UniProtKB/Swiss-Prot annotation, chain A:
UniProt cross-references to HAMAP family, sorted A to Z: Ribosomal_bL25_CTC
Role according to the record: This is one of the proteins that binds to the 5S RNA in the ribosome where it forms part of the central protuberance.
Gene: rplY
Protein name per its UniProtKB record: Large ribosomal subunit protein bL25
Molecular functions (GO terms): 5S rRNA binding; structural constituent of ribosome
Source organism: Thermus thermophilus (strain ATCC BAA-163 / DSM 7039 / HB27)
UniProtKB/Swiss-Prot annotation, chain C:
Domain of life: Bacteria
UniProt name for this protein: Large ribosomal subunit protein bL27
InterPro entries referenced in this protein's UniProt entry, alphabetically: Ribosomal_bL27 (IPR001684), Ribosomal_bL27_CS (IPR018261)
CC per GO annotation: cytosolic large ribosomal subunit
Annotated organism of origin: Thermus thermophilus (strain ATCC BAA-163 / DSM 7039 / HB27)
Curated annotation (Swiss-Prot), chain D:
Assembly description: Part of the 50S ribosomal subunit; part of the 5S rRNA/L5/L18/L25 subcomplex. Contacts the 5S and 23S rRNAs.
Organism of this sequence: Thermus thermophilus (strain ATCC BAA-163 / DSM 7039 / HB27)
Top-level taxon of the source organism: Bacteria
Keyword RNA-binding: yes
HAMAP family (alphabetical): Ribosomal_uL18_B (MF_01337_B)
Single GO MF descriptor: structural constituent of ribosome
Protein name: Large ribosomal subunit protein uL18
Swiss-Prot record, chain E:
Name used for this protein in its record: Large ribosomal subunit protein uL30
GO cellular component, one term: cytosolic large ribosomal subunit
Superkingdom classification of source: Bacteria
Keyword Ribonucleoprotein belongs to the record: yes
Gene (name only): rpmD
One of the Pfam families matching this protein, by short name: Ribosomal_L30
InterPro entries, A to Z: Ribo_uL30_ferredoxin-like_sf (IPR036919), Ribosomal_uL30_bac-type (IPR005996), Ribosomal_uL30_CS (IPR018038), Ribosomal_uL30_ferredoxin-like (IPR016082)
Organism per entry: Thermus thermophilus (strain ATCC BAA-163 / DSM 7039 / HB27)
RNA sequence: UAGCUGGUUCUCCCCGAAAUGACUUUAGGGUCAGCCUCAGGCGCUGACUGGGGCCUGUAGAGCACUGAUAGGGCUAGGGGGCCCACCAGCCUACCAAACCCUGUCAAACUCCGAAGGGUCCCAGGUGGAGCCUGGGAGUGAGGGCGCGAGCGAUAACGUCCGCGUCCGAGCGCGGGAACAACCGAGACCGCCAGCUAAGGCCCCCAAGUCUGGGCUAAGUGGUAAAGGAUGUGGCGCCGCGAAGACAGCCAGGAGGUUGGCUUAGAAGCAGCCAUCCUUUAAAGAGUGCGUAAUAGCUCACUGGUCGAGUGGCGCCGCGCCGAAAAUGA
RNA sequence: AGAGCGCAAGGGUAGAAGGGGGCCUGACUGCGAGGCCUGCAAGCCGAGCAGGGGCGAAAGCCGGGCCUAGUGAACCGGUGGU
RNA sequence: UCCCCCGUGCCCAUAGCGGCGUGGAACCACCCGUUCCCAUUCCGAACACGGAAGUGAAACGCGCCAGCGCCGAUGGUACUGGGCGGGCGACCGCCUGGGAGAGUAGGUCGGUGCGGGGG
């Protein structure tokens, strides 16, 4: 979806920030210059899409170049946004994370023990034509001390995988009742 | 309450603490997170007291993860014994905490629950804190 | 004031530390016999017209110029160009 | 694997690299400096006799003369897996004082 | 290659060794001194060095 | 005798030290080396800097080794068993070799590793620079200030080093009210001459009660914290409203039910789990209060009046509380 | 290259220092340029040259030891000897 | 002056690892023999030596692929020469010049120099 865009130059980093606009960068196989945009609207847009869905930045050069984000480098101290990277899209093989949707409340759950998941996004290679909005995956009946991983998840056809996939996707573990104070003994 | 298990040298130098935090500044784990603002030590005593404080507030809770680890000696000497002579004794095990550092995460609760949990627990911490959700940082191994 | 016990020690010791390192860098002229490297190991293996001895030392073999060298799968080296 | 830089133990100054196959000798004189080689002779690659040993003798001997024929005194002797059986050229005739 | 002249502004009295040695390099002995010295990036280096205790100008 | 104490007389002109390095029956003492000095020898070489070339392992950062580590996976396996042996087979919210994923810790860990720094050549550089012999020294209790590490308690006008600077020897001058080392500042003499540094410009006191915009209401200013708050003023966001919100003001404020369990009784209502659906504009298996449980007050919620703005979530500038001590403020 | 590398540690190490055998005794004498280090005195580096040898056909290295601890000025006197 | 194999040198892993295919008409390698030189702390495995009808299996030589392993921009933060602040303090900010680490895109199954034997 749409955000503005602004061609960056040889202007000092700090100032662009403490004026009104966060700075950025874009690169695709050969195309590399420097860019930047507003803060507040950018933050709004980001909070939705970010490295989940697709961005479309219409730039003061005449066009409407659509990218994805990629990497959110911050200041860490009083941590908060400060220069991101953008990825100029196409139709070529590309790995990226897909936010997953654990749907349905299992048996390990409701018995007490709660899901201690591993991921909320999986690395997967796809053609940029496939948009796997979010794999609204099962988690029908996970048990306490029970796990699930691998290719267990449904994958939207074409949208391949990119781990092992023995990467354990999630699992349910015990609570932490006041009987853990008896442990203090 | 955490420490290593007898390792290398016993006594080591406390040193001054800057503020790059080196790393550890997002959620990734739980869902709600307590992160700090004052460059100090986290005390194993406190550490346990806060972990409890949370657990205590919400009987039969979820899973409370502890990112930081208290693994530094308290070089403390006896009392009224005059100076020089020896270093001290390793005592009170603590850790370096530089602001903008995740220390504990609550997962699987009410909004209110993790709010007041992190609230009270960190309220018991040797300093003061900020309590954040889980979003703007996504993508970091 | 109460001066009872006080835990003593058995630590404080070091070394009349001799001064070790690259004595003569590059661009430097030697009359042969001038040692260019006092090292403990072989951080600097012999170069052209440079010799080594019992204490791992790159010294001069002629009257020329120290030239530095690196060889990833062979180590680092210090040599002496002729100057005829 | 007789690498060992037997080369280095002969990398005093000026080599002479030789090696054998199943049937053919490859006697060559290599000078370093830049890497430039120099002088050749081969038991069964000079179109010569088909008896490894004696040919080699003569071939080295051939090369031997060749050495002095183009201004050679003393050099090294690049040989890997030898078990030192001379190859009674040993370039001992070999001008060079091979042996 | 235009000439560079400087004016000594802030007292040498209380500054690191390199600073003092630089001033003592520039034919600069006490305050308020128009020093007209031809350009040479050695001298310039010695300016960006002393740059604050002094004031500059590339007078032609 | 006294490596100790004490005293040590005339004037101007020049430079100008050190409170360290080792060594000792030395620590409050002497040789020596560094630092001051004067004569004679040397002549761009020296401090400093530009260029090139090199050495380096810290600040960070990384986890690839060294160990420390939190959470899950996977499992060698260890408690194990189901239950046959010339030996097998299948098996857990126990714990656990390793590996893997998930974060991370380090002065004596290091794949990476800068700003710097040291140093060898090209050149500028004339300065109480530097170099060489030579006589006389005095020094060898130091202190302060800044970042840099140790000690200490990330206490001490504490201590012990590093680079740096001042006091020391500049208790000579202006600031800082006063004030060895904090700011300005290197004081041959004379001048009833002007500029300016810091710091100031109502007055003590010399100079702007100068111009313009923005804040605060406490003597804040005129000296403290976490932590608490309908203090004040701008910024940003997020639902509600003329189809009528916000507050108050009328009224509705229901049924299976006394929810299943606990429980002496637990009936929204001391706790455990709850996680209905139905008549309805709307009444929830409940917001607090009330009971022996009950009753009951009230709310929540929708419509009646009313008729314009409202409820709240963060940030930021200054304050408010937090905040008790010894002669007169 | 994480093992061994005599014994603490660190650097170093198979393109060997480690590990096997043969041979031997340079764990030489007379020196020693030019250096490291440096208050002095000490300590530490080494080609080279002569002798006369050990190893290898040689090329070649050998004036102990992978490297840094294993040490004691002088005065006194014993010692074999010119 | 060229296309191929071999004896061998240089950069330092964009050369290494691994699946695929491969060439011997010369080179190369296995391979034929263990009686003459030689030797296994035992074996002719290794080095050694005299030698064919085969082979190209391996060893090796060459091509494709990135899958492991390797290098890795750009930006911006870190840290910091040197210059000024602010807070009792633990610490924090402005100036200039320098300028990483981790990661992101992409890239990589080599580069080259010699001397002979072949067409």
């Amino acid at each position: 979806y749409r955000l503005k865009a602004y061609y960056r130059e040889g202007e000092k980093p700090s100032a662009l920030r403490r004026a009104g606009k966060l700075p950025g960068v874009m690169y695709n196989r050969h195309l590399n210059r420097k860019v930047y945009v507003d803060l507040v609207e950018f933050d709004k847009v980001f909070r939705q899409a970010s490295i989940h869905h697709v961005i479309v930045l219409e730039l003061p050069d005449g066009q409407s170049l659509p990218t994805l984000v990629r990497q959110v480098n911050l200041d860490k101290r009083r941590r908060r946004p400060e220069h991101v990277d953008f990825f100029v899209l196409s139709d070529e093989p590309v790995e990226m994370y897909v936010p997953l949707r654990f749907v349905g409340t299992p048996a390990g759950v409701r018995a007490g023990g709660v899901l201690q998941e591993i991921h909320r996004d999986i690395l997967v290679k796809v053609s940029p034509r496939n948009i796997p909005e979010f794999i609204e995956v099962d988690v029908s009946g996970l048990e306490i001390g029970d796990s699930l991983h691998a290719s267990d998840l449904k994958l939207p056809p074409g949208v391949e995988l990119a781990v092992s996939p023995e990467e354990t996707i999630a699992a349910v573990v015990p609570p932490e009742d006041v009987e853990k104070l008896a442990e203090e003994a | 309450m955490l420490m290593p298990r007898r390792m290398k040298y016993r006594k080591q130098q406390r040193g001054r603490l800057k503020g790059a935090t080196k790393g550890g500044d997002y959620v990734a784990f739980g869902d709600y997170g307590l992160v700090a603002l004052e460059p100090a030590w986290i005390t194993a005593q406190q550490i346990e007291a806060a972990r409890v404080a949370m657990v205590r507030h919400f009987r039969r809770g979820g899973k409370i993860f502890i990112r930081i680890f208290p693994d530094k000696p308290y070089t403390k000497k006896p009392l009224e014994v005059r100076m020089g002579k020896g270093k001290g004794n390793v005592e009170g095990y603590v850790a370096v905490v530089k602001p903008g550092r995740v220390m504990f995460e609550v997962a699987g609760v009410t909004e209110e629950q993790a709010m007041e949990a992190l609230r009270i627990a960190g309220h018991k911490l040797p300093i003061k804190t900020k309590i954040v959700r889980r979003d703007a940082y996504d993508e970091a191994q | 004031a109460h001066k009872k016990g006080l835990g003593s020690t058995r630590n404080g010791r070091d070394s009349q530390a001799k001064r070790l390192g690259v004595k003569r860098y590059e661009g430097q002229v030697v009359r042969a016999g001038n040692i260019l490297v006092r090292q403990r190991g072989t951080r600097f293996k012999p170069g052209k017209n440079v010799g080594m001895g019992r204490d791992f030392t790159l010294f001069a073999l002629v009257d020329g110029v120290v030239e530095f060298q690196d060889r990833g799968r062979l180590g680092r080296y210090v040599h002496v160009r002729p100057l005829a | 694997k007789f690498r060992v830089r037997n080369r280095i133990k002969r990398t005093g100054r000026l080599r002479l690299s030789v090696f054998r196959s199943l049937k053919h000798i490859y006697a060559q004189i290599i000078d370093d400096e830049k890497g430039v080689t120099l002088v050749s002779a081969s038991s069964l690659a000079l179109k010569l006799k088909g008896n490894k040993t004696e040919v080699a003798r003569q071939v080295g001997r051939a090369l031997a003369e060749k050495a002095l024929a183009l201004g050679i005194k003393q050099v090294a002797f690049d040989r890997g897996p030898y078990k030192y059986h001379g190859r009674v050229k040993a370039l001992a005739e070999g001008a060079r004082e091979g042996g | 290659m235009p000439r560079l002249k400087v004016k000594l502004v802030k007292s040498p009295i209380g500054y690191p060794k390199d600073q003092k040695a630089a001033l003592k390099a520039l034919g600069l002995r006490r305050l308020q001194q128009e020093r007209v010295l031809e350009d040479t990036p050695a001298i310039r280096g010695n300016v960006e060095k002393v740059a604050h205790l002094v004031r500059v100008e590339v007078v032609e």
